[PDB]
Amino acid sequence: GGFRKETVERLLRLHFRDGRTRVNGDALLLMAELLKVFVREAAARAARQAQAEDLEKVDIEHVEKVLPQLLLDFV
Amino acid sequence: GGFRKETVERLLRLHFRDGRTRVNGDALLLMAELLKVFVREAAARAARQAQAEDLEKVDIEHVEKVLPQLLLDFV
Amino acid sequence: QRELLIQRLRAAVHYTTGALAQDVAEDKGVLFSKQTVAAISEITFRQAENFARDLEMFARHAKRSTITSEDVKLLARRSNSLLKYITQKSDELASS
Amino acid sequence: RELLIQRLRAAVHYTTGALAQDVAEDKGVLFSKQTVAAISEITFRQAENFARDLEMFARHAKRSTITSEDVKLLARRSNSLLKYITQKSDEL
């Protein structure tokens, strides 16, 4: 499973500041992998925080709690 | 008040992968001002948190509470 | 028509994010609510924006308008284990 | 070089403490000795992140000398910051 090349291309293109900017094909495949790693890390950290609170259901509070260090780790 | 240019140059060089990497004078002055702002922001955030708890004494737990957002606002 | 294209992109990100997150839910023995999945999709959408803006500025720093694998390696510069996987995921491509 | 690290840490520490007293006066607080030590250690450690990024950014531009361009990139997400440090730097 993972993000389609076209989804990543459209995502990046939507967010560029400069109309000149483009992404070559190899970088697109690498960014699809990096985005999948990001999602998996977000979900795994949120799940571990719920388990730390002895909970079966992961709530949006749990995502909010892990988000700061998640973002710092992907700088 | 602030960090001496010598301190900032040696501090950056200590942390380079290659100690022969050079840094010009303009960059050193910008980095001295950046580190001064970083210290003052860390101190102000920790103080501003201790005041939220109705305390005039700022303790290390207050630094710990504000650190993730401090780093997020600088990276 | 711009907003139709954006909504479709958001939907694509969401269902793929949700598919990936449920693999993790199973390995950990938890359930993600639909709002937790929606929150992770939205964070992922906004993190793609952070990634895109960095890649753009990294490429421009090297006087390029085209983003390459070298700019992606720079995104991963701080995690050797992540940089290591991306680096030799990258070198498979350049060999073909 | 036997004492370089110790000397840098001490110089960073006492300057950090001095700078924090301006904030203490402005907010009417007292920073504990351990709080100041914590802030100066965070600063020492964060300086490493800054330094390694600057070095890599210069190499990415095919330079072995870090310039203000590399600092601008370092501050790419803090335009208010970059603009203040540039203004304070020109106060020179």
Numbering used by the authors:
A (entry chain C), B (entry chain D): 6 to 80
C (entry chain B): 8 to 103
D (entry chain A): 9 to 100
Pull verbatim passages from the article behind this deposition.
MHF stabilizes FANCM and promotes its DNA-binding activity.
The root-mean-square displacement (r.m.s.d.) of the heterodimer region was 0.5–0.6 Å. How FANCM dissociates from MHF was further investigated and it was found that the presence of 2-methyl-2,4-pentanediol (MPD) and an oxidative environment may have promoted its release. However, under these conditions MHF retained its complexed form.
